[PDB]
Amino acid sequence: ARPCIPKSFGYSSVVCVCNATYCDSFDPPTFPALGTFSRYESTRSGRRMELSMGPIQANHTGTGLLLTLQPEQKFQKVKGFGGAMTDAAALNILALSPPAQNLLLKSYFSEEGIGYNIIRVPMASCDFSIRTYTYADTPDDFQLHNFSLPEEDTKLKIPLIHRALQLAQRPVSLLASPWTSPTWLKTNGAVNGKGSLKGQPGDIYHQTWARYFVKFLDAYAEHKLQFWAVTAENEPSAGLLSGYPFQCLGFTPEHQRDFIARDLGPTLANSTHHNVRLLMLDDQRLLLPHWAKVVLTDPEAAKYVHGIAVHWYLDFLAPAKATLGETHRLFPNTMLFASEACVGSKFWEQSVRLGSWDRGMQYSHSIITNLLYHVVGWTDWNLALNPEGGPNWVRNFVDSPIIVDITKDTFYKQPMFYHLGHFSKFIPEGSQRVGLVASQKNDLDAVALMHPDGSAVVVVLNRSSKDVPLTIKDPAVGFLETISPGYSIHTYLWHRQ
Ligand SMILES: *[C@H]1O[C@H](CO)[C@@H](O)[C@H](O)[C@H]1NC(C)=O
Numbered sequence: 001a002r003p004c005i006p007k008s009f010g011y012s013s014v015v016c017v018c019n020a021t022y023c024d025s026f027d028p029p030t031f032p033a034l035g036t037f038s039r040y041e042s043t044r045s046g047r048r049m050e051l052s053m054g055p056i057q058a059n060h061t062g063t064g065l066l067l068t069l070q071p072e073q074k075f076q077k078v079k080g081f082g083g084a085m086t087d088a089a090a091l092n093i094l095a096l097s098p099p100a101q102n103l104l105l106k107s108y109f110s111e112e113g114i115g116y117n118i119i120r121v122p123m124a125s126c127d128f129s130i131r132t133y134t135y136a137d138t139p140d141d142f143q144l145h146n147f148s149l150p151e152e153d154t155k156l157k158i159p160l161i162h163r164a165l166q167l168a169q170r171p172v173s174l175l176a177s178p179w180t181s182p183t184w185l186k187t188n189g190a191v192n193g194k195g196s197l198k199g200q201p202g203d204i205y206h207q208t209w210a211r212y213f214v215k216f217l218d219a220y221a222e223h224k225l226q227f228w229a230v231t232a233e234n235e236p237s238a239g240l241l242s243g244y245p246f247q248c249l250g251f252t253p254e255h256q257r258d259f260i261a262r263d264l265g266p267t268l269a270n271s272t273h274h275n276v277r278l279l280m281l282d283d284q285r286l287l288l289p290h291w292a293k294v295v296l297t298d299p300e301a302a303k304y305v306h307g308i309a310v311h312w313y314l315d316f317l318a319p320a321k322a323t324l325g326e327t328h329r330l331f332p333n334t335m336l337f338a339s340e341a342c343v344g345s346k347f348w349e350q351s352v353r354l355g356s357w358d359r360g361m362q363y364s365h366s367i368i369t370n371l372l373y374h375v376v377g378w379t380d381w382n383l384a385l386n387p388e389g390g391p392n393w394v395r396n397f398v399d400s401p402i403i404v405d406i407t408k409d410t411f412y413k414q415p416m417f418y419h420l421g422h423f424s425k426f427i428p429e430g431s432q433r434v435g436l437v438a439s440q441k442n443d444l445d446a447v448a449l450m451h452p453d454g455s456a457v458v459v460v461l462n463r464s465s466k467d468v469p470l471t472i473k474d475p476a477v478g479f480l481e482t483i484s485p486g487y488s489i490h491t492y493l494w495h496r497q
Helices: 087-093 098-109 151-167 204-222 253-269 290-296 320-330 357-372 415-424
Strands: 006-008 014-019 036-043 050-055 065-077 080-084 118-123 173-178 229-231 277-284 307-313 335-342 375-382 402-405 410-413 432-438 444-450 456-462 468-474 478-484 488-494
Touching: 014 098, 036 415, 050 478, 065 375, 065 444, 065 456, 080 415, 087 098, 087 151, 098 151, 098 402, 098 410, 118 151, 118 204, 118 375, 151 204, 173 204, 204 229, 204 253, 253 277, 253 290, 277 290, 277 335, 290 320, 320 335, 320 357, 335 357, 357 375, 357 415, 357 444, 357 456, 357 488, 375 415, 415 488, 456 468, 478 488
Parallel strands: 065 468, 080 118, 080 375, 118 173, 173 229, 229 277, 277 307, 307 335, 335 375
Antiparallel strands: 006 014, 014 410, 036 050, 036 488, 065 432, 402 410, 432 444, 444 456, 456 488, 468 478
């Protein structure tokens, strides 16, 4: 029930200011009767997920673009939306006073916020850490007797995850991903650079690494936290590049295939955590469908892979059809999940641009393209970063939906936050993407889904500067007459009975 406190920092739009005693928020969900729709709108001009309502009439007065809901045409069901609880995000959140911390967590996970239901958790350190470390740095301890969780986990990440679940509107799913293994298991004996596991799949090195996954899950289970899934490795292709700066662990598609088939798969299966899902790839989509073909065409490996995790750098171009589309065609029964997204890597662009509407549009656009190409989930990177895009021990290069200003006990909600929210808040787990036919060529990006209870949700993004007259038809209800303003994003919701 609290509006956004706008503030400009010289970019295309504003950020919403939050501190220890104030943050913009929503009232509990209130669903209108059949014949009425709810519209949430955000615009570059300043509007932030503002709610309005209107009628769905039997008569059609519009003569422009028409989007027709086709509920009978069913597609993928949604797993959820969320972000990463990296060391950096945790450090930034915990730098605020407790009252502010709660307003930030509520913004993300609460019904008063945008209802995140997914949190990606790095297994030990990555570039968004203030130091390098793994859970077993003590050399040659192949039985992992000295495996343990550091302060980053027990004092920062875990307590914040518990608080998020507590505030959570919906059940939250945890996803774990490792960047590097202890250095004594790597060919190059370093946390980064070009290096992979030593030996070959099946040996003591590969068996210890797989055991590490189990140890990680055990440790977190001791802290009353269970995981929905883990990925086989974060960006496995990065560890094949000479001089790679961040923590990594190289795997060729063939190496991952064998590691999963011979080590990871069996090990997780024979553990008490057998129900945890295993996602392969967890890398850029331009590596598809090749990586998919190499791993999934091997029965011994395929039987352990539940889905394919993909990453994407919004600042770059990548054909979705040749990657996501082709991969779904070749393996229609293996879910596609976006495990990491980020923007601002442009060498000429600042890592953090407070109030950038473009970066927001890149987020919602990416989510729509993903949804239109079978993806069941979209996961952001760092939940929060400081004004310089840190802390990062190597270098700051990406933005974050929420920026924390510790010296002022305040945090800013970027347009990215709201563009993400237009989906995360209104698309609960179990929602199913359905048909939405455009009557003619247009400049809008749109997607329709059906909630588990049968109600409809349609997101419309206008990345152009011109207002677009629009009519949305639901065969069972009628016509919804509206207008998609230039540089705006809308989420429409309505009962179908
Ligand atoms: C920031 O939040 C409110 C809203 O603008 C502002 O009036 C106040 O000065 C700050 N709140 C506190 C006490 O931190």
